[PDB]
Ligand binder design. Sequence first.
Ligand code: SPH
Ligand code: SPH
Lengths: 287, 49, 287, 48, 246, 246, 96
Amino acid sequence: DPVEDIIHRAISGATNVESAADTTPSSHRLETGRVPALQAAETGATSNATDENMIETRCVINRNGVLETTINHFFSRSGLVGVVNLTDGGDTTGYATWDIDIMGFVQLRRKCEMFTYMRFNAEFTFVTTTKSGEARPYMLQYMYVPPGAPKPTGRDAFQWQTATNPSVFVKLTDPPAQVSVPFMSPASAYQWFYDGYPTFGQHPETSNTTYGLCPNNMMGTFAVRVVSREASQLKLQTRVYMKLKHVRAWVPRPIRSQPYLLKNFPNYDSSKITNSARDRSSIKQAN
Amino acid sequence: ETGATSNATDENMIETRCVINRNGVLETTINHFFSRSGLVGVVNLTDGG
Amino acid sequence: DPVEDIIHRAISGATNVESAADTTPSSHRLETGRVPALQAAETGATSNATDENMIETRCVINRNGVLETTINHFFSRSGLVGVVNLTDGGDTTGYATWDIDIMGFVQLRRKCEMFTYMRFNAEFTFVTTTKSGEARPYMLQYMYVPPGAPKPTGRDAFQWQTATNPSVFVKLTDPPAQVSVPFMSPASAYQWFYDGYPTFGQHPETSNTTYGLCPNNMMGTFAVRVVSREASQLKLQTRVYMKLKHVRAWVPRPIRSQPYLLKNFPNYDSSKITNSARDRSSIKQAN
Amino acid sequence: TLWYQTNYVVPPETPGEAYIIAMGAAQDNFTLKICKDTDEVTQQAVLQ
Amino acid sequence: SDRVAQLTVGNSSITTQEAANIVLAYGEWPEYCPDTDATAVDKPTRPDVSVNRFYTLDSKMWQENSTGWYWKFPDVLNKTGVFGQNAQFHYLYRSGFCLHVQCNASKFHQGALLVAVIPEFVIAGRGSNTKPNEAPHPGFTTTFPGTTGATFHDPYVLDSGVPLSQALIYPHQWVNLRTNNCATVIVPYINAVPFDSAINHSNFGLVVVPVSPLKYSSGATTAIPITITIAPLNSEFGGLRQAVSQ
Amino acid sequence: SDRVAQLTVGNSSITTQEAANIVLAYGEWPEYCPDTDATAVDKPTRPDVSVNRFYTLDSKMWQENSTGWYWKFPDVLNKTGVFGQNAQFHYLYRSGFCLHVQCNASKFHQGALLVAVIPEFVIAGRGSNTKPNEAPHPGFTTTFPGTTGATFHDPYVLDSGVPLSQALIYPHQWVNLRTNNCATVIVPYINAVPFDSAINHSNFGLVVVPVSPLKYSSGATTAIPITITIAPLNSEFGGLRQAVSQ
Amino acid sequence: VETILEVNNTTEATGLTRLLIPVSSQNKADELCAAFMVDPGRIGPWQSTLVGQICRYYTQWSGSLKVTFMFTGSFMATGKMLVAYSPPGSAQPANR
Ligand SMILES: CCCCCCCCCCCCC/C=C/[C@H](O)[C@H](N)CO
Ligand SMILES: CCCCCCCCCCCCC/C=C/[C@H](O)[C@H](N)CO
């Protein structure tokens, strides 16, 4: 009132659609200035031309289900995020440690990298066996080590008392061990691509290895031993599978075209660029 | 080309505040513009020559 | 409502007082913790101790008038703001020019400089005479030359046609000429002290003569001639007096203690500092 | 100041140099005051 | 009617004859952070007209062999304007951007550019080395090129190892010399956090890649500059401290 | 109750035990410019928390012979802080200041300082020359000393040729070592114009002049610093352009 | 009312070429076409305008001014220009 200038939606909305879209009967049109076919791809909007407008269609009531394509059924499938090798007999050793990264290798990585942001819970399953595949009645310990907790320095270390760190004791002959994990990020979503640096300061142009790393994705360490006072002589391998549940995804992006060279980095080899397609004989002959 | 001057105003081009202008427009009327006297002629008279 | 923080007097008032304040009868007080005498000069507020509180007073109804001290009666008195010397006979010459500054000399300058800001109208009076004081029936022309108008280059110049510039034709034997002037500043008040520079750019530490000057105080030029085609032989002197009326004043300040050395600048001579007071014999003897 | 944002592009066989005419005026908040006499014109002597 | 258009923000204005509509990314407008989403307790500053306005960067000359260019937005504007000064004195940053790309050409020129806003755009190292310690990493000045921008080595993979054909899954617009002379896209603030540092993190990149190359006839104008104009929109700052530019 | 007090503005806070009240100059608060008083038509920017806050300058060491110091406010803050950056990028400026002067000392020290806010404070040249062309003029760095401040040659006339005894006609406060350890004054924006340039014009000066000198006994602490804290208050800016610092 | 404003002055252009300012294909990008100070009462471009002649009968002026640019090039020519106004405090900008 003393001064006036201090005195001062979206676009669309989501429709619940249980089944695929139907088709309605149409007939020939002859008239002017009505043209569903002509589009402008420059505007950045995809063609809104439908079936019914382009040619004559019948009445089709479509019963095909759309459910199986939801992102929450798309990640419901478990996959192998890591495999850790434990040899209790070799030299001293005695324990194995695996820093938790689900980028460890391909198939599940390539799925999760078609979205920039994902929030979700997880379910880990531990399939353990001998190098020979056989099972033997030895008890194992799986201890989870959140960021900042001291790592086990040996098989006899006091780290394994686990007054705080959650553990799983399971014999090797028993069914696999399975646990649920919440969403533990300090942020509001996991992000598989972070463009930026974790810290301030100088950034050399020789070795940038600090670049790209997002601290919000560091969940700490998973450790495993075999529980005895004397060192057993055996070799052992632990595969880790994870379902991914209660999932939400934001700002989708393209799939990886090129083979992955590194675990944490999206590097590729520029001489070998694959040209995702298959080569052909000229054009204007299709197979 | 139309021969009409630009009707673009302040408020349309950029963001402006609320200004209530008290400046007077009176002094620019043609009737105050010619109210000032001026020298239209000077005549030389010599009675003795 | 979506965000809260975007959702968001004086002290005293003026009393109309026609006459000086009265006095009300008081008597002795003996009690504790009521002390009008003790003040704190550190707070920056002047003592509010009155008569009635300090000692016993009678009932006095004061009829003395306060009117004569208003700023509008204080500047109602005319004063000499400039004097211009015109010799029409000497060499070529023929005209006199006086750039309008009311700081020209002292008495009126010292009054107006006890306020920082003054808005007012003015009334100029031109007293013209010969060097000998005598009056002779010659006609004079006083032309006012606003900022940016071309100045007269000679007695015969076309500048004197005055189709725009206001002029005053008056014979020398007639009563003085008198005119009213409005408030012509481009700002909202005249200001007698401007701390700053009129322009941007570099400011040498050798000659700063640009410093201190306020363009808003430049009203242009006042010119004078005597109207004839042939050059008269006489000497002439024009004193300019101005009443100052419809005056308003802001943020008062102290008077000049030291003699003025320059017209536009508040310079003084630091060896001669006057110590405004009169010297005395020790203390504890009053005259 | 008047700057080139991008460039001045012209097809082949068309003049490669052109002209911008410039113009000026005032708006409804524009005012003036303190009428004076202009300096644009001078006179050396009476005009017969 | 739809072709012609004019924007305005701050004291800056843009007019276009031949423009084709406007892209509003992900169907949402830029907004201030709501009270529920906020975390940091200090009162953020909202400069408005001093920050929000169009800034024009230096122009790129587009040549027959040009491979494309890219930028990082809370980078290009960190050293320029009043927006850049608030960004160096504040630890926290949020805003959306209104983006405009401009390329003129005659009706005798032909070609097409792909303008795209690609959030969290992470360039990659180029080499066959699989060992993580000896693997190449893409410089500092290649990651944050600043106002001058950087150019692709191999635009087909977008330096990200990802096919450019699928880049249409990002808010994008074509500038086609026969159709429109400019492209315009408004981007709301997106990130996993309500505020984020301006100097460390780059929310999104911009990619102008010449899909169909530039072609013309002898006698036509050879020099075809490309100019980008970006308006930080609905800005916020917080966490005041001494200036840190790096 | 009245002695103790705490200010707050922006992210900065000041607490005082021994303070004596607060001076509000000319009985008016700082305000934004009303619509009627405004002239320039652009929408001014109102940064608030980034600009309005307490800024502390370097400290002056007050010695037995000290003659006093002075400052110019839309000067000291032009090169420091976010306030200084807005001032260099904007042609127009308006704001009031909340001012605080601080001098500690023991109950065994004695002395008094006169703190005063003296609008349009114009220093003068010192010399006997009456000719305007050869007359001395007081330097650039003496007129706008910047953050470091300048000291009086002869405080009795305040370098203005005006008696210091009458300086009490200005908003002022004493800091008396036996009474209070700090002085505080709030100054509304005053000038003949609604906005004015920050780098050219200095609205008002501050004067700390040691009226009664500093005296103490052997064994007491010798070093007695004086520190000033100033909060630009209720700020406004306009006329955006490229940075001009001089 | 809008009136023809002279920008090109120099010693050249003779009579009527003073009204026109050239635009042409530039090799180096980001180049300055023309400039002038916007004070209408100052000797310069505004003397040819009829607003600039009428403000010389008056001491002071207040208000917003507008400048119009019309492009006389051929229909087949295209381009984009940036016209900017910089409030005081510095000389004309060196780069855009
Ligand atoms: C008893 C062992 C339980 C282990 C519980 C750990 C669960 C970890 C949280 C889910 C995984 C978070 C997503 C992983 C991020 C990425 O793989 C890397 N940190 C980034 O390269
Ligand atoms: C026929 C002659 C009429 C003359 C009318 C001129 C009136 C001038 C306006 C009143 C005086 C303005 C106050 C003067 C300012 C100061 O003296 C200096 N400019 C600053 O040093």
